[PDB]
Write a protein that binds this ligand. Structure first.
Ligand SMILES: Nc1ncnc2c1ncn2[C@@H]1O[C@H](COP(=O)(O)OP(=O)(O)OP(=O)(O)O)[C@@H](O)[C@H]1O
Ligand SMILES: [Mg+2]
Lengths: 603, 63
């Protein structure tokens, strides 16, 4: 088949495909090229994705999920997860194994399911355009995603009914999307990605040798929990503090008011990317005991810049670190490109431009470059583009915990992937039954200060003196950037089974069940689409019949008129409901009674 | 187990700039991503990398 490309964003998602030799982004059902990454669960059993979900969020706050990318692959006790727990309208809860989940209508749900709903909308869009089924996709993740996040995204892709060929890092995808225009030559570029939830910086070299583009990632750094949402949060906090200051009401209790306030806040930020002053104007924001209250606050561009300056500065440090790891200076960067909606803010462009002493390119669409890059990568996997190769790296050092809590690096950060590293382990005590290895990702010197991938237990070590047996352990990092640990008896070659404990993520059982539930939800959503179309047919029939009655006038039996009008009203009532069977029944009855009218037509 | 220099095919005294040229073209030939075919290429490629990494480091190259 064909491999579609999916930019799965914190805020907006996007799907692009490979029209032979020229990739194109596909508009969704509503005609938008970018689909909001919002997922709503209605009372009636339907599932809304994108702009509809965005519309009905105010009446269904607890069941409208957003920013799930900022929970996927994370633990419930993570600091950022707790801070979000206090903030979000929906209920974030700890799973059975400690992973961060969300509760919808009393059901516990894993982030890969929700993100899989979004993925399903993208896949269905691609199928509608293509006219044939789609089973294979390349999905984008931030460069700084840890192992558990990447594996969790891959699982979300599997629940979407997709065979995930490649997990691509967003700045890398944008890099080749930018690189297809360029001719033969050598360049070095800095990709600055500041989206709705994540920030990445990647230093990438693009050399052309024998008609074969080589995109080598020299370095990468970033923060997976820094994005537009936090700019929004700063402006929100300012508005709340000013409202409590002027009217005496802490607005953080009213969740509806907080929803209206986040909408207005982001709107004001975006409006301040091109104006010099806007007004946050919310009438009847809340109801005091004495009477309803109002908000009308002036915000200058300078005020917003002051409110988010430390956030902007938080992004400059990984530039220094990345240039250090790449062994380059600011003057070695031939081009710098901005990716992500949040880079549209004038201050971000100014701070970046002044760090590099250079003006970023202007011919890059930050909203559409990642997706088209993913589509092209899919083309590389199939074969339709043979002139491009991508050499990505892993962003985090992979090590094990040793005595004293210190961490020991096995594979350092910025190592080109896929890669393999083997090491010999042995027993430490006489007749040691088993050995346990603590595998983690991060740069900190204490094991507790890093992200634990888990404890791998090699049981079934027959008794022996301390230190005699030799077991070779092999650490693999595939092209997705995901770890695969295999073991083997060094001397003999007999394999060694590995038990993973204290780990994160879904397993095969959870996966299968959630695939089945995804299919069931798919059939249910088909039925919902059916009900919408049937409701349209009903409204058309109402209009047609009333028109025909007026045209008929007095020349219609009073009994017939009466019965038809009763049937009409019954049908209108059925059309206000959500029962397809009742609507169809009422339509049929209306036809039976309006037989005389349709006879009166007579051409 | 195989000679680093020989699997890339280098003079054994050629400078870093050349071994990088050889790595990039070999990475092209043996990348799993490119062929998409098998683990055999990814297993071979991982070693072509490992040779490129040891030979660009000055001290480890002396070893
Ligand atoms: N004109 C603008 N000025 C300032 N910010 C903007 C503008 N347009 C969009 N944004 C911000 O960009 C963010 C989303 O951009 P984008 O779609 O690139 O993020 P994403 O890729 O979905 O998120 P991520 O890549 O972090 O997962 C939103 O938070 C929005 O507030
Ligand atoms: Mg993005």
């Amino acid at each position: 088949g064909k491999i579609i490309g999916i930019d799965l964003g914190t805020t907006n998602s996007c799907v692009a495909i490979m029209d032979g030799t020229t990739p194109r982004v596909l508009e969704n059902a509503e005609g938008d090229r970018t689909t909001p990454s919002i997922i709503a669960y209605t009372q009636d059993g339907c599932t809304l994705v994108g702009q509809p979900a965005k519309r009905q969020a105010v009446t269904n706050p607890q069941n409208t999920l957003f920013a799930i990318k900022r929970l996927i692959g994370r633990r419930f006790q993570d600091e950022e997860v707790q801070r979000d727990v206090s903030i979000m309208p929906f209920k974030i809860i700890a799973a059975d194994n400690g992973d961060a989940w969300v509760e919808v209508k009393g059901q516990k749900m894993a982030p890969p399911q929700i993100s899989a709903e979004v993925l399903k909308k993208m896949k269905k869009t691609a199928e509608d355009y293509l006219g044939e089924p789609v089973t294979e996709a390349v999905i984008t993740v931030p460069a700084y995603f840890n192992d558990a996040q990447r594996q969790a995204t891959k699982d979300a892709g599997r629940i979407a009914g997709l065979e995930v060929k490649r997990i691509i890092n967003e700045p890398t995808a944008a890099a080749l999307a930018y690189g297809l225009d360029k001719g033969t030559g050598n360049r070095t570029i800095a990709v600055y990605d500041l989206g709705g939830g994540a920030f990445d910086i990647s230093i990438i070299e693009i050399d052309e040798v024998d008609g074969e583009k080589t995109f080598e990632v020299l370095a990468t750094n970033g923060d997976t929990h820094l994005g537009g949402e936090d700019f929004d949060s700063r402006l929100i906090n300012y508005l709340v503090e000013e409202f409590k200051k002027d009217q005496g009401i802490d607005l953080r209790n009213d969740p509806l008011a907080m929803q209206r306030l986040k909408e207005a806040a982001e709107k004001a930020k975006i409006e301040l990317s091109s104006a010099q002053q806007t007004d946050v104007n919310l009438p009847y924001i809340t109801a005091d005991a004495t009477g309803p209250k109002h908000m009308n606050i002036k915000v200058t561009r300078a005020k917003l810049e002051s409110l988010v300056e430390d956030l902007v500065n938080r992004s400059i440090e990984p530039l220094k670190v990345a240039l250090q790891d790449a062994g380059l200076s600011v003057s070695d960067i031939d081009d710098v490109i901005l990716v992500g909606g949040q880079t549209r803010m004038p201050m971000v462009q100014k701070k970046v431009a002044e760090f590099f002493g250079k003006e970023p390119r202007k011919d890059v669409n930050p909203d559409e470059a990642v997706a088209i890059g993913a589509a092209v990568q899919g083309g590389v996997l199939t074969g339709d583009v043979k002139d491009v190769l991508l050499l990505d790296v892993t962003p985090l050092s992979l090590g094990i915990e040793t005595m004293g809590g210190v961490m020991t690096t096995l594979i350092a950060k910025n190592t080109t992937i896929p890669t393999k590293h083997s090491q010999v382990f042995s027993t430490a005590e006489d007749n040691q039954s088993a050995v346990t290895i603590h595998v983690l990702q991060g740069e900190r010197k204490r094991a507790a200060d890093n992200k634990s991938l888990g404890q791998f237990n090699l049981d079934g070590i027959n008794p022996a003196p301390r230190g005699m047996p030799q077991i070779e352990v092999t650490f693999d990092i595939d092209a997705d950037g995901i770890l695969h640990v295999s073991a083997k008896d060094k001397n003999s070659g007999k394999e060694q089974k590995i038990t993973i404990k204290a780990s994160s993520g879904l397993n095969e059982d959870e996966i299968q069940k959630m695939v089945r539930d995804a299919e069931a939800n798919a059939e249910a959503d088909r039925k919902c689409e059916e009900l919408v179309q049937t409701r349209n047919q009903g409204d058309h029939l109402l209009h047609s019949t009333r028109k025909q009655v007026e045209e008929a006038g007095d020349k219609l039996p009073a009994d017939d008129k009466t019965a038809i009008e009763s049937a009409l009203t019954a049908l209108e009532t059925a059309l206000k409901g959500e029962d397809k069977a009742a609507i169809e029944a009422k339509m049929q009855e209306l036809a039976q009674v309006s037989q005389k009218l349709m006879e009166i037509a007579q051409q | 187990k195989q000679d680093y220099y020989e699997i890339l095919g280098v003079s054994k005294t050629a400078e870093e700039r050349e071994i990088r040229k050889a790595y990039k073209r070999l990475a092209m030939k043996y990348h799993p991503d490119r062929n998409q075919g098998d683990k055999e290429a990814e297993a071979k490629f991982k070693e072509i990398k490992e040779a490129y990494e040891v030979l660009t480091d000055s001290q480890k190259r002396a070893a």
